[PDB]
């Protein structure tokens, strides 16, 4: 009967009463009335709203002159212009100055019972002397730095050391192949790379140094490779280029000044797969990104300084960037860096970790939840007394999974927050607010502050007013943490995001807005498919399969599949094509089947 079929007879669930009873502090908003008052101001007078929000949450070296200039169609947006600041000062120094012994990072290592806690003062020391290493090797403000690191606290040290000298960190997921690492390092023109000798994940060894070595044969601009000794195994060594992390930091002081950055200086590049297949270096600048990260951390995830925040995503993706690293440290709470998998040593591991460290918010992808639900509820028998927010990112958390998450995991005690956003948006844009917004299973709920969503007719591009409508999901106004360009290719940025429907930002997603105005995300309308938590390009898989000798026409559709048009050993060839995609992208992009 309704146009948004997924919302039909879907009831609204209030925040559980025990959430407020057990909450250690006073909430950030008084209820939905204040959300609405603040939301309306953020849409009608963004210059006033965001100026106050920024000065609440971020410490500027020099105050900004104007909240925002530029327009969506101009592709010239700038936020907090005239301001100066440094991201590592806001993530580290200001908290170490106030409370040096507060724990900033809980490292949970691949083996249970290892790991360690790191204070804000210890973090300031490690960020400083790592920054000294890069400065001493010639890294300068505005240079990019390639990072190929697994989930160890040294990954946070590296992002924040780059920020501290005004270098632009370019994190490459540590499961990518050498070709993928090479492509991103070449496009970023990085002269310096940081990696490990090996990674340990789920009891398995990852030869990171060997992969970097292969990639660097084709990156002649890289002149220094800083290697952290994670396992101590014998790895190949290039005299005159390779340096040991522990040997170099021991040479340098435990404090370094922070470089004064413009609000609009680049902070990082994050390569994503687009529909073309060539990686897009999505570029975020400094002040607006940090304002969005802190604002969503505070109001979406209800983060207070004493909290212990655990995001299960990898630093190689935007979820790890914004919610393992920037948001919790900006706000001065504790963040969990988790090196293992949810299944090692056993399927209880996530809850083992939450119980031991008394985690207050947990943030994961529905792929992991489905894996664990199939494993069985006997793996969950953990008090987890302090767990009050349960986040979900990457796809709509469906009814069966939402119930299991709310009942079996959260014991009907925690608020489930389904956060919709993208690498290009920097931070959450459609989401319930933790402890505030009533939710519907499968819905992302309502827009965050400063986000003005519209539903467009896919063909004519016209706005579709009112409720119970469906179509293209676009935003009508700029927002502080929006991506500012695609590295080296502003025209691709304009054409991809801003010129499709002029005057709007195009998300690439379809959506319905139900009778109550709640949003229901429909998934990509372009050629980007999301498989097992990874944003993959079907064109990139096709281009990999075509790279084989016998393959001519290759087609990939979405669990992604690949039908190739070719050969007298078909059973023996299906392995050679699978390995071809393993060399081009990585293990995590091999097709589920190779059709002929």
Which residues are within 8 A (CB) of 468 and not within 5 positions of it... i.e. 6 or more apart? 2, 3, 4, 512, 513, 514, 515
| 530 assigned to some structural domain | no
Half-sphere exposure of 405 (CA within 13 A, CB side): 29
The string over 98-111, giving b where at least 16 C-beta atoms fall within 10 Å of a residue's C-beta and e elsewhere, is eeeebbbbbbbbbe
Rounded to 5°, angle at Cα 467 from 461 and 470:
45
Residue 494: inside a domain: no
In a domain, 44, yes or no: yes
Q: Show the tokens assigned to 211.
A: 């992969």
CA angle 385, 31, 480 (to 5 degrees): 95
DSSP structure class, residue 12: P
Q: In whole angstroms, what is the distance from residue 441 CA to residue 426 CA?
A: 24
Q: What does the CA dihedral 128, 131, 133, 139 come to, rounded to 10 degrees?
A: -160
Three-state SS letters, 13-78? ECCCHHHHHHCCCCCCCCCHHHHHHHHHHHHHCHHHHHHHHHHHHCCCCECCCEEEECCCCCCCCE
Q: Is the peptide bond before 514 cis (omega within 30 degrees of 0)?
A: no
Q: Which of 511, 541, 547 lies closest to 527 in space, CA to CA?
A: 541
User: Which value, to the nearest 10 degrees, does the dihedral of the CA atoms of residues 552, 558, 561, 565 take?
Assistant: -20
Which tokens go with 49? 């709203």
| Residue in 397, 427, 394 with CA at minimum distance from that of residue 410 | 397
Half-sphere exposure of 453 (CA within 13 A, CB side): 32
Strands of the sheet with 334-338, listed across from one edge: 116-119, 103-108, 334-338, 308-311, 361-364, 389-393, 415-419
Cβ neighbours around 25 below 10 Å, total: 10
If we measure between CA atoms, which residue out of 501, 359, 505, 360 comes closest to residue 426? 505
- Annotated binding-site residue? 116: no
Residue 272: inside a domain, yes or no? yes
Q: Which of 549, 531, 516, 539 is nearest to 589 (CA)?
A: 531
Q: What is the CATH number of the domain that holds 75?
A: 3.40.50.12780
Alpha-carbon gap, residue 533 to 311, rounded angstroms = 14
Using an 8 Å Cβ cutoff, are 62 and 84 in contact? yes
Could you write out the DSSP letters of every residue in 130-194? HHHHHHHTT--TT-EEEEE--SSHHHHHHHHHHHHHT-EEEE--TTS-HHHHHHHHHHHT-SEEE
3-state DSSP assignment of residue 247: helix
Please report which residue ranges of 376-434 form alpha helices under DSSP H.
Answer: 399-404
> What CA–CA distance (Å, rounded) separates 536 from 551?
21
Tell me which residue has tokens 């190689």.
316
Both tokens of 575, joined, read 């392995």
Q: Quick check: is 109 in a domain?
A: yes
Q: How far apart are CA 375 and CA 369, in angstroms?
A: 10
Quick check: 49 and 479 in contact, CB under 8 A? no
Q: Which residue has the tokens 């290592």?
A: 109
Tokens read off for 10 = 């879907």
Q: Is 253 inside a domain boundary?
A: yes
Query: Is residue 314 part of an annotated ligand binding site?
Result: yes
- Please tell me the distance from the alpha carbon of residue 25 to that of residue 102, in angstroms, as a whole number: 18
Q: How far is CA 456 from CA 218, 266, 275, 463, 495, in A?
A: 44, 32, 21, 5, 18
Query: At residue 179, what are phi and psi to the nearest 5 degrees?
Result: -60, -45
Q: In this structure, is residue 57 part of a structural domain?
A: yes
DSSP state of 379: G
Experimental method for this entry?
Answer: X-ray
**Distance (Å, whole) CA 481 – CA 268:** 12
Provide the sign of the torsion angle of the four alpha carbons 496, 497, 501, 506, taken in this order: positive
Sheet bearing 561-565, strands edge to edge: 553-557, 561-565, 594-595
Phi, psi of 254 (to 5 degrees): -90, 5
Count of positions (residues) in the chain: 596
Are 351 and 338 a contacting pair, CB within 8 Å? no
Report d(CA 362, CA 413) in Å as an integer: 13
Q: Is 201 annotated as a binding residue?
A: yes
Place of tokens 């890294």: 139
Taking a C-beta distance cutoff of 8 angstroms, is the pair 190, 222 a contact? yes
Q: Which domain holds residue 289?
A: 5-453
Element (H, E) at 528: strand 528-531
Measured between alpha carbons, how far is 143 from 162 in angstroms, rounded to an integer?
A: 9
Q: Give yes or no for a contact between 394 and 428, defined as CB atoms under 8 angstroms apart.
A: no
SS3 (DSSP) at 385: coil
Count other C-beta atoms under 10 Å from residue 569's C-beta.
Answer: 10
| Alpha-carbon span 210 to 178, nearest angstrom | 9
- Rounded to whole angstroms, how far apart are CA atoms 184 and 207? 19
Gap between the Cα atoms of 16 and 14, Å rounded: 6
Distance of CA 465 to the CA centre of its chain: 32
Number of domains forming the structure of the chain: 1
Beta strand spans in 314-460 (E): 334-338, 361-364, 389-393, 415-419, 453-456
Strand order in the sheet with 280-285: 242-244, 224-228, 192-196, 144-148, 168-171, 266-272, 280-285, 485-486
Is residue 545 a contact partner of residue 554, using CB atoms and an 8 Å limit?
yes
Considering only the C-alpha atoms of the chain, give the largest distance between any 2 of them, rounded to a whole number of Å.
71
Spatial contact of 403 and 441, defined as CB atoms under 8 Å apart: yes
Distance from CA of residue 12 to its chain's centroid? 28
C-alpha distances (whole Å) from 249 to each of 125, 157, 176, 252, 521 are 10, 12, 27, 6, 47
């Amino acid at each position: 009967l309704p146009v948004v079929v997924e919302a039909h007879q879907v009831d609204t669930f209030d925040v559980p009463g025990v959430f407020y009873e057990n909450h250690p502090h006073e909430p950030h908003l008084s209820g939905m009335n204040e959300y609405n008052q603040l939301y309306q101001q953020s849409i009608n007078d963004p210059d006033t709203f965001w100026a106050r929000m920024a000065r609440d949450l971020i410490t500027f070296e020099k105050d900004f002159d104007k909240t925002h200039i530029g327009t969506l169609e101009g592709g010239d947006n700038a936020w907090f212009v005239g301001g100066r600041l440094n991201a590592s000062f806001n993530c580290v120094d200001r908290h170490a100055m106030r409370d040096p012994n507060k724990v900033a990072i809980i490292y949970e290592a691949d083996e249970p019972g290892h790991g360690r806690s790191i204070t804000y003062a210890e973090l300031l020391k490690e960020v400083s002397r790592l920054a000294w290493v890069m400065k001493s090797q010639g890294v300068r403000k505005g240079d990019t730095v390639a990072i190929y690191l697994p989930m160890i606290p040294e990954a946070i040290f590296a992002l924040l050391a780059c920020a501290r000298i005004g270098a632009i960190h370019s994190v490459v997921f540590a499961g990518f192949s050498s070709d993928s690492l090479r492509d991103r390092t070449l496009d970023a023109r990085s002269k310096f790379i940081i990696t490990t000798d090996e990674g340990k994940r789920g009891g398995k060894v990852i030869g990171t140094k060997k992969i970097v070595d292969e990639a660097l044969k084709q990156c002649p601009d890289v002149t220094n490779c800083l290697v952290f000794k994670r396992t101590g195994a014998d790895v190949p060594w290039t005299k005159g280029r390779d340096l040991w992390w522990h040997e170099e930091v021991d040479k340098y002081p435990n404090y370094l000044p922070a470089e004064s950055m413009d609000s609009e200086d680049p902070l990082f590049l994050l390569y994503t797969s687009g529909s073309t297949g060539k990686p897009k270096g999505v570029m975020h600048t400094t002040a607006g990104y940090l304002v969005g990260a802190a604002a969503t951390g505070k109001y979406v995830f209800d983060i207070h300084p004493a909290d212990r925040f655990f995001c299960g995503g990898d630093v190689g993706w935007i979820t790890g960037h914004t919610y393992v690293v920037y948001a919790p440290l900006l706000l001065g709470c504790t963040t969990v860096v988790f090196e293992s998998t949810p299944a090692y040593p056993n399927f209880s591991r996530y809850w083992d970790v939450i119980e031991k460290h008394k985690v207050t918010q947990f943030y994961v992808a529905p792929t992991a939840l489905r894996l664990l639900k199939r494993a069985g509820d006997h793996h969950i028998n953990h008090e987890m007394k302090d767990l009050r927010i349960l986040g979900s990112v990457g796809e709509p958390i469906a009814a069966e999974v939402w119930k299991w998450y709310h009942e079996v995991v959260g014991k009907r005690q925690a608020h489930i927050v389904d956060t919709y956003w993208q690498t290009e948006t920097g931070s959450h844009v459609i989401t319930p607010l933790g402890g505030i917004t009533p939710t519907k299973p499968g819905s992302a709920s309502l827009p965050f502050f400063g986000i003005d969503p519209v539903i467009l007719d896919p063909v004519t591009g016209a706005e579709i007013p009112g409720n119970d409508v469906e179509g293209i999901l676009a935003f009508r106004k700029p927002w502080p943490s929006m991506a500012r360009t695609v590295w080296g290719d502003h025209k691709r940025y304009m054409d991809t995001y801003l010129n499709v429907y002029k005057g709007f930002y195009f998300t690439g997603d379809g959506a319905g807005r139900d009778h109550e105005g709640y949003y229901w995300i429909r998934g990509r309308v372009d050629d980007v498919v999301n498989v097992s938590g990874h944003r993959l390009s079907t064109a990139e898989i096709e281009a990999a399969l075509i790279e084989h000798h016998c393959v001519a026409e290759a087609a990939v559709v979405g669990a992604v599949h690949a039908f190739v048009a070719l050969n007298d050993n078909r059973e023996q060839l299906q392995k050679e094509l699978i390995m071809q995609v393993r060399k081009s992208i990585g293990p995590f992009a091999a097709p589920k089947v190779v059709f002929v």
